[PDB]
Structure 1
Amino acid sequence: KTYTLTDYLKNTYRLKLYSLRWISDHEYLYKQNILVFNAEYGNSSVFLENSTFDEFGHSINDYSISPDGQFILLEYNYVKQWRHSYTASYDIYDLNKRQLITEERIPNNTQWVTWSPVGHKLAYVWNNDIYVKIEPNLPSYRITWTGKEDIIYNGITDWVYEEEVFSAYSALWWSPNGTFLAYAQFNDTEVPLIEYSFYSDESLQYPKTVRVPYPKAGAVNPTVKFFVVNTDSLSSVTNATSIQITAPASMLIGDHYLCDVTWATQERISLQWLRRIQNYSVMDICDYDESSGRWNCLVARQHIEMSTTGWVGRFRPSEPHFTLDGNSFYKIISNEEGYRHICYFQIDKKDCTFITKGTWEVIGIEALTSDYLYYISNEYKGMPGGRNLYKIQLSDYTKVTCLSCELNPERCQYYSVSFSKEAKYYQLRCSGPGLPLYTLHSSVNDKGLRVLEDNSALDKMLQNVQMPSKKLDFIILNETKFWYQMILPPHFDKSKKYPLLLDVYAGPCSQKADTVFRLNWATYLASTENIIVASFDGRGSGYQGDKIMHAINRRLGTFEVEDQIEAARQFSKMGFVDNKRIAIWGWSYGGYVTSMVLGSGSGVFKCGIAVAPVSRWEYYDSVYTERYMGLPTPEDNLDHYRNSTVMSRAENFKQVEYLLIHGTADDNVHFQQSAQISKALVDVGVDFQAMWYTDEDHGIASSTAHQHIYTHMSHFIKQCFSLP
């Protein structure tokens, strides 16, 4: 038997996780019931019995225990908004007392809640305003009063910062001991609103109009102020006083973005600021002043990170990791050869020294001790698609140890890590190319305590299904390696010719050729429909340095699109490809590239599917779009904006079978984008397939919508390829 479309849709084969949340340096919480496990021995004491809130009536969506382990935050009434944002109701359960707190409770529709890093102080955001509870039962002090819906965001992010800057709805940053609460403020007054219909339930007679402050490329942007309030001063009588930290003079000269907040010490905070032309960022180090009551960030302590070849950071300037005293940090930066390596910085000195080097990249700093820095990288075997954990010795940058390489080279080449509070322990998560494998390790000597999850359950029932295999490799192109991957059908015969589907993302810093094991739609097409699903990372892709990544700077819709074609050409020359049956499909950026490719008039692709595609960059949001395209003005880049639309390629669609799918409530890539593609294809008499999804958003994540779309796509694909 094979991995059927149903298998994918109704999760017949589950990848078991071992999600843990470290509560201390010794212990971690697990949701078996909620257990406390001891890292040393693996013994567990039932922390919270499953049916304690059976006496509540509400469905508990999430739990959160205060750092001093005295109270638990209960989240219910979950109503999701955007990618990260949501609304919810909350009850604080006193663990000691063994009962809910009733007076001075947390309001309904709280946008964000977070415990201080130590103790049980609690800050939350209601109606765009910030509130602090020093104690779970006492009243909350009102920090901000300027909060106004769709207009002023205090402690939480507006649409664009949520999506494109912080990957988070939260804009609150406690100091390390919780003395201070730092927060951003967003002004959207003049940001214009994307508007679209919400049809809601059948019972709703007149559809509602949704209106989000959304800046499209070139539009007026949200502005940002940054504040820090002393939570160890809050009067029940006098209004809380918030101290502002203004952006650097070199940021105030025009449109900027606050792009990173990181606490250094108890009285030292770091702020990263980006220009709207995202090739220039400045980091401010801000020290608290007792005899001043304010926050100073010396012009001397500023650190610049810039890029002449493109934009700065992968998606934003990398965050710094400060040594206990906060007089030095490390942050990943592009080096002189354009590879992203760790740099040691001294608070007071302009120049850093790179502590790693080579033709590979540091993915992210993971934990920083007094003896050792722990990082993740793709150095092992020169494979950008793999991930290992490395320990680099602080006193000797030569003494580098791979802590996950050898553990299991055969089934494990893509690791993520989770360190306990003090990094005494770490949990390794390999997620390919064998089944995902979760293991616990003690860092003091790096020996492996025990296997947490190994997926024997999955492993067992799998040898029953004719599963597909992955091939990860590279083609040479202009004397450079470009990595690709293929999900190859079971019993792959290379003398037979196969239909190929190119799975595309190919946005900047994209990586679709990796060592991760996945059970998805591609798995089904390979397993059941015998279709090779191939993916390629061309110019513009990430984790291979700047020469590759920056190649599409100011030129979206050029090379990253040309290389998908080139790759598919190179696949055809690989012997096992039926070049009469080659498809391409992609979502968001992939939708865009797919459409760009399908309209290139190359003749390579018989057909394609574009889900939620960007159609022209002036339609997508400012932060992300301008980061690569600059501004759509005659004095900047308007020419290429004009030149890189899927509309302009409409005439070439006469050569292919197109399937265009979009959700009507997509706040992200607005239905507008597919609406203009269709009008384009209509205006030139191109027949194509379409599909809207009523009230689906960019996710198309509704259980039934997801089931509907993949079935629809499967039918289209099967039909493009003459497959009953």
Structure 2
Amino acid sequence: RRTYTLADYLKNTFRVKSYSLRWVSDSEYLYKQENNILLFNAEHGNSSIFLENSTFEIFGDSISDYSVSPDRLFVLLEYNYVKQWRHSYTASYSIYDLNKRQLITEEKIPNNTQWITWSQEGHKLAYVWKNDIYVKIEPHLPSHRITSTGKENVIFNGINDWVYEEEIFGAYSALWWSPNGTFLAYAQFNDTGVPLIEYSFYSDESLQYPKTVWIPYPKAGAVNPTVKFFIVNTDSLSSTTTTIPMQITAPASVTTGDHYLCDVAWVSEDRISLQWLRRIQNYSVMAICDYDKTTLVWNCPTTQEHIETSATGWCGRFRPAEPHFTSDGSSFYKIVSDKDGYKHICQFQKDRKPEQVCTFITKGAWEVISIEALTSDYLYYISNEYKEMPGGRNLYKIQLTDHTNKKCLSCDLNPERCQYYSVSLSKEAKYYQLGCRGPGLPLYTLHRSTDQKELRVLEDNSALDKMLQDVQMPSKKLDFIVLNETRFWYQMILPPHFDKSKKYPLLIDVYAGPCSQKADAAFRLNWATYLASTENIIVASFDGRGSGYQGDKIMHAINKRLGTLEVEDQIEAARQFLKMGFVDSKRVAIWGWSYGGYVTSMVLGSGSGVFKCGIAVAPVSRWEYYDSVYTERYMGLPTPEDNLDHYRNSTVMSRAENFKQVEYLLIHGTADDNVHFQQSAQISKALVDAGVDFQAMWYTDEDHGIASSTAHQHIYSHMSHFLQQCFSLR
């Protein structure tokens, strides 16, 4: 009869396993097993050693990661990894010659590379270093410099500046090899007019004077970085000292004022797709460009333009969805909101057609989460259609030739244990691995695409299961409540022997930012686990307005006015939970991180009287302090000509007074490059001026994730005691 200890969480006592494979072909994949890369044969367990427990140790214990060239002839060995922002980081590299069996040592790769990648074909390498792009046709050969305009915090070649890396593309990379690797496309950003933010860094206690880190960061309404798209011909490098890249200029309907680059997608080797967005993400354009062999130039005829629009708010969830072209690249499928505001898959022809550019292949009050593969006859995708559970994930598949031959492939499998799947099809969809994150313990299995025959079970968490036997684990209810005639899902982490008759303290867990989803059918062992399994606290989350994958009516509901409906609904939801009986109204709390810290703060400061205390970690306190791309997408510009009013109305500090009725815990990281601390500094200052006592805690040199080992443990222990004091436990 043991409970899930806070130490069980902090020291990761119970490990949850998974099967992360790397498809090498349409029939084999790679897998890391005891620091040995093994090549497996989907169909038969047939394995084989690809790289040894060995190799990886020459570069000591700093071997961060590995990347095998597509022709399996070489392997990139990453080491001396150094983080920088959410996705950026620099490392050192070594090419290992599989065949020659040894580390290539001649034309080595710079000891501080910002980014590197193989081509999609052979062993071509493109890497950014010192903000400049370099190409190596083959591992042993010398490095060819592609750009030279590169300059720290000013000119970025092939990598994204801070805001792009964070808000547009999900990563640091701004490179794109064409299939067959003839061309190499890339973006270049000029951060010149972009203002700087400058926080202090204290480093070791031996540093006598703290450093100052500055970052070109555009806050709402500020001058944004600029872009340019280039494509350089890789096949000529050996015959010149310098090659001249060809530039593609964004479509006219976007160039009049500020704008951004949305997505890059190679159709074939003479056709590329680029998506552009206006600073006011009300409008989006996806041009298709063809390579003219004669005049050696790329053309993007308005005839192949394609426009995406939104009268309710903005485009896509975070950005227009990505196109998926056919082989002959004559058509493509893309996820776009239909007439009812539901994100669904529809067809397009390279050439736009007057208000009929689309033809939906999907309908319903549910949404297609993402397209996973496009066979010459089938379209594999993932949706939350099944059982009308917006919080569930299932793998479907439609026959192109017959849009009726639509079939779910994971719905049956384990309806009890699995309702939240992740997929991964082989190079040509011959096999597909399933990742069950579903209610129960994560279950990984691979199947033969043809008939779905489950070849074998890659990973069932029997080990984890065996251990969780001797522990009083809490349960998780995933249902919905109905407000103003609409379903709104929520989830509750119920403490062990949960008796519906008794009264328990409630803790609302929040985020609730645009298009977010806190209520889902995925298994997790987090802090809330400990909170219910040992403190008997009910941890609940509620996806209200401006959220998830339930149509734009619900998501766009927040448009032009953050800090409104999503906050309110969070309070309503608490009301409902109370009316559900088992909640001790005298002990209701609410905490949130990032955007969640904002809502938590806005809720505590609403004077609704429904909450006793709360904790906001690295919250946003007013939208002018947050970056441009994100904020403006939901708020527009902070100008009297636009939405200045809603900007100034949604301030946390403007609700300082109402905090007198609450125990508040404000936590923030000193080196938070995302939500600047300036944000919390402005909150504390507002409460101090209001004469409201509260509790604060800064984390020296910590990120926006306060994720360093010692800090991570410290912050959760601290919040634990805060709740214990607040809930009269401890």
| TM-score bin, normalised by smaller chain | over 0.9
* Counterpart check, 1:646 vs 2:647: no
Deviations 1:440-499 (A, max 9, x none): 011122211111000000011112100000001111101000000000000010110010
* Counterpart check, 1:283 vs 2:286: yes
2 CA distance for matches of 1:576 and 1:51? 57
% identical equivalent positions: 85
2 CA distance for matches of 1:680 and 1:106? 51
Change in 2 beyond 3 A, CA 1:601/1:255? same
Q: Which residue of 1 aligns with 2:26?
A: 25
2 CA distance for matches of 1:713 and 1:43? 49
Q: Which residue of 2 aligns with 1:389?
A: 395
Secondary structure (helix, strand or coil) at the match of 2:100 reads coil
Secondary structure (helix, strand or coil) at the match of 2:572 reads helix
* Counterpart check, 1:561 vs 2:567: yes
Q: 1:478 aligns with which of 463, 468, 484?
A: 484
Q: Which residue of 2 aligns with 1:143?
A: 146
1:141 partner letter: H
Deviations 1:500-552 (A, max 9, x none): 00000100001000000100000000100000000000100120000000000
Deviations 1:120-165 (A, max 9, x none): 0000000000000001111111111100000000000000010101
1 CA distance for matches of 2:358 and 2:392? 28
- Cα pair 1:141 1:236 within 8 Å, conserved: no
Secondary structure (helix, strand or coil) at the match of 1:287 reads strand
| Alpha-carbon offset, residue 245 of structure 1 | 0.5
Q: 2:197 aligns with which of 194, 199, 203?
A: 194
Task: Output aligned runs, 1:192-271, within 5 Å.
Answer: 192-235=195-238, 237-271=240-274
Deviations 1:372-393 (A, max 9, x none): 0000000001000000000111
Greater than 4 Å deviation, 4+ residue runs: none
Task: Output aligned runs, 1:593-608, within 5 Å.
Answer: 593-608=599-614
Deviations 1:258-282 (A, max 9, x none): 0100111111000000000011000
| Alpha-carbon offset, residue 54 of structure 1 | 2.8
Report the more deviating stretch, 406-415 or 228-237: 228-237
1 CA distance for matches of 2:658 and 2:104? 65
Secondary structure (helix, strand or coil) at the match of 1:240 reads coil
* Counterpart check, 1:454 vs 2:460: yes
2:565 partner letter: F
1:570 partner letter: Q
| Alpha-carbon offset, residue 44 of structure 1 | 0.9
| Alpha-carbon offset, residue 662 of structure 1 | 0.5
Q: How many residues align?
A: 724
Deviations 1:77-136 (A, max 9, x none): 100001110000001011111111112110011000000001000000000000000011
Q: Which residue of 1 aligns with 2:95?
A: 92
1:199 partner letter: Y
Q: Which residue of 2 aligns with 1:122?
A: 125
Deviations 1:355-414 (A, max 9, x none): 000000000000000110000000001000000000111011111100000011010000
1 CA distance for matches of 2:459 and 2:475? 22
Q: Which residue of 1 aligns with 2:422?
A: 416
1:324 partner letter: S
Length-normalised TM-score, structure 2: 0.99
- Cα pair 1:141 1:240 within 8 Å, conserved: no
Task: Output aligned runs, 1:318-717, within 5 Å.
Answer: 318-350=321-353, 351-717=357-723
2:98 partner letter: L
Report the more deviating stretch, 43-52 or 638-647: 43-52
Which ranges of structure 1 fall in alignment gaps of 5 or more residues? none
1 CA distance for matches of 2:59 and 2:720? 44
| Alpha-carbon offset, residue 232 of structure 1 | 1.4
Deviations 1:172-203 (A, max 9, x none): 01112211101010110110111000001111
1:399 partner letter: N
2:246 partner letter: I
2 CA distance for matches of 1:281 and 1:263? 18
* Counterpart check, 1:12 vs 2:9: no
Report the more deviating stretch, 208-217 or 345-354: 345-354
Secondary structure (helix, strand or coil) at the match of 2:680 reads helix
Q: 1:179 aligns with which of 182, 185, 188?
A: 182
1:446 partner letter: Q
Deviations 1:580-607 (A, max 9, x none): 1000000000000000000001000000
2 CA distance for matches of 1:15 and 1:236? 53
- Cα pair 1:288 1:296 within 8 Å, conserved: yes
| Alpha-carbon offset, residue 53 of structure 1 | 3.9
Change in 2 beyond 3 A, CA 1:558/1:56? closer
Task: Output aligned runs, 1:52-91, within 5 Å.
Answer: 52-57=55-60, 59-91=62-94
Which ranges of structure 2 fall in alignment gaps of 5 or more residues? none
| Alpha-carbon offset, residue 631 of structure 1 | 0.1
2:300 partner letter: C
Task: Output aligned runs, 1:43-58, within 5 Å.
Answer: 43-57=46-60
1:704 partner letter: T
1:263 partner letter: W
Change in 2 beyond 3 A, CA 1:675/1:98? same
| Alpha-carbon offset, residue 349 of structure 1 | 3.4
| Alpha-carbon offset, residue 239 of structure 1 | 0.9
Report the more deviating stretch, 204-213 or 43-52: 43-52
| Alpha-carbon offset, residue 238 of structure 1 | 2.9
2 CA distance for matches of 1:220 and 1:61? 37
- Cα pair 1:343 1:355 within 8 Å, conserved: yes
- Cα pair 1:75 1:88 within 8 Å, conserved: yes
1 CA distance for matches of 2:340 and 2:47? 49
- Cα pair 1:142 1:240 within 8 Å, conserved: no
| Alpha-carbon offset, residue 668 of structure 1 | 0.4
1:709 partner letter: I
- Cα pair 1:155 1:184 within 8 Å, conserved: yes
1:253 partner letter: T
- Cα pair 2:59 2:79 within 8 Å, conserved: no
Secondary structure (helix, strand or coil) at the match of 1:210 reads strand
| Alpha-carbon offset, residue 420 of structure 1 | 1.1
| Alpha-carbon offset, residue 55 of structure 1 | 3.2
Change in 2 beyond 3 A, CA 1:591/1:289? same
2 CA distance for matches of 1:113 and 1:671? 33
Secondary structure (helix, strand or coil) at the match of 1:232 reads helix
Secondary structure (helix, strand or coil) at the match of 2:231 reads strand
1 CA distance for matches of 2:58 and 2:289? 48
Length-normalised TM-score, structure 1: 0.99
| Alpha-carbon offset, residue 52 of structure 1 | 2.5
RMSD: 0.8
2 CA distance for matches of 1:595 and 1:650? 10
